[PDB]
């Protein structure tokens, strides 16, 4: 479901609008890559379909901090 999962960044729509300004309904899908995060504490290697930058989050706002939430919302985890 091409979803950030960690931030929710979903694919938005738009227009390629080539030169001369021409309607070309397209879409912008997240980076995403899915990783193998080492919770360490829980001693588990939970793999999440995280998106670029959205990763910088786990590496900044905290792993189990994020894993905390997402798990509170009732997401896979």
């Amino acid at each position: 479901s091409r979803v950030c999962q960690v931030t929710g960044k979903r694919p938005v729509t738009g227009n390629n609008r080539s030169h001369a300004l021409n309607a070309t309904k397209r879409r912008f899908l997240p980076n995403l890559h899915s990783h193998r995060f080492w919770v360490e504490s829980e001693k588990r290697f939970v793999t999440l379909r995280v998106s670029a930058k959205g990763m910088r989050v786990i590496d900044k706002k905290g792993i189990d901090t994020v894993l905390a939430e997402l798990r509170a919302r009732g997401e896979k985890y």
Binding site: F37, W38, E40, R56, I58, D59, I63
Partner: protein
């Protein structure tokens, strides 16, 4: 990405030091394996003391007991005989295994392993310089008096 080292690590090791690194190294190796910890502040600006409990507290005023320095100066006179005789000479010798045990019945006691002496005075009788230094820095002084049985 800073993170504090925790062991080896090539061109950046200190078993405990903060060095700028790439996130591609952390959460990928430097960490997931037990070799570092992010600059979560909670381990730096809140662990500064912890990561400094051997200098700012120890190595600067560490008086745990290193008072055995000058400690020796006013005692029962460090007169350690050595059996004298023969036209005014001696018999045995005095060095360490005598100055230290000297404080046997004196309750206290010093370690013959803690002293200072350039060379070794031959057979004489003059006060020795068996200075009892509790620690390299804070040393002391100790004498010897080859008495007669």
């Amino acid at each position: 990405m800073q993170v504090i080292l925790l062991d080896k690590v090539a061109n950046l090791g200190s078993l405990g030091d903060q060095v700028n690194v790439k996130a591609g190294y952390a959460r990928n190796f430097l960490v997931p394996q037990g070799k570092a910890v992010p600059a979560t502040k909670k381990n730096i600006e809140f662990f500064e003391a912890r990561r400094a409990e051997l200098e700012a507290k120890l190595a600067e005023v560490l008086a745990a007991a290193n008072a055995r320095a000058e400690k020796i100066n006013a005692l029962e006179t460090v007169t350690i005989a050595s059996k004298a005789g023969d036209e005014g000479k001696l018999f045995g010798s005095i060095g360490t295994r005598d100055i230290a045990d000297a404080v046997t019945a004196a309750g206290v006691e010093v370690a013959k392993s803690e002293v200072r002496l350039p060379n070794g005075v031959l057979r004489t009788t003059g006060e020795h310089e068996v200075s009892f230094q509790v620690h390299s820095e804070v040393f002391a002084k100790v004498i010897v008096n080859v008495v007669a049985e």
